[PDB]
């Protein structure tokens, strides 16, 4: 699904204790790549959920 | 422009992937994205993760593996994970949405 670079970061978040499916992890990483503030990513993630 | 296209596609597939739904706010929210992490912030965030996770060494040990390689967006991604631990509701959603897709 996701490439060696992203595979590392996923393993990181994984051993960090959180689990999110590889597909959305890939987009998050991508949103970071386009230099979106992590807080903005978090805020919209929070809104998109319940 | 073809930047904004990519953002919209990203917002869109998340709506798809997370079973959502006005999401034009997400576009405005994500489109304020101006450049600057601090040395404490990543330390503050990092100690908070290591408290939360079981197997904290694994996280710290591969934090170390992966900083020496200067891997891209490592620190803003670690800041994000700390922010996600705090909000236990949306942590659990992501937790569940991942069970749905197995």
From Swiss-Prot, chain A:
It is found in: Cytoplasm, Cytoskeleton, Microtubule organizing center, Centrosome; Cytoplasm, Cytoskeleton, Spindle. Belongs to the MOZART2 family. Part of the gamma-tubulin complex. Interacts with TUBG1. This is Mitotic-spindle organizing protein 2B. The gene is mzt2b.
């Amino acid at each position: 699904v996701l490439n060696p670079e992203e595979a590392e970061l996923y393993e990181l978040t994984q051993a960090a204790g959180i689990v999110i499916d590889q597909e959305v992890f890939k987009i998050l990483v991508d949103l970071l790549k386009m230099n979106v503030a992590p807080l903005a990513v978090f805020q919209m993630l929070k809104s998109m959920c319940a | 422009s073809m930047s904004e296209f990519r953002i919209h596609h990203d917002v869109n597939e998340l709506i798809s992937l997370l079973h959502v739904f006005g999401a034009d706010v997400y576009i405005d929210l994500l489109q304020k994205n101006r450049t600057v992490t601090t040395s404490v912030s990543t330390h503050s965030a990092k100690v908070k993760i290591a408290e939360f996770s079981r197997t904290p060494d694994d996280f710290l040990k591969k934090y170390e593996e992966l900083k020496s390689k200067n891997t891209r967006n490592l620190d803003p991604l670690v800041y994000l994970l700390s922010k996600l631990i705090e909000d236990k509701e949306t942590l659990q959603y992501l937790q569940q949405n991942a069970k749905d897709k197995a």
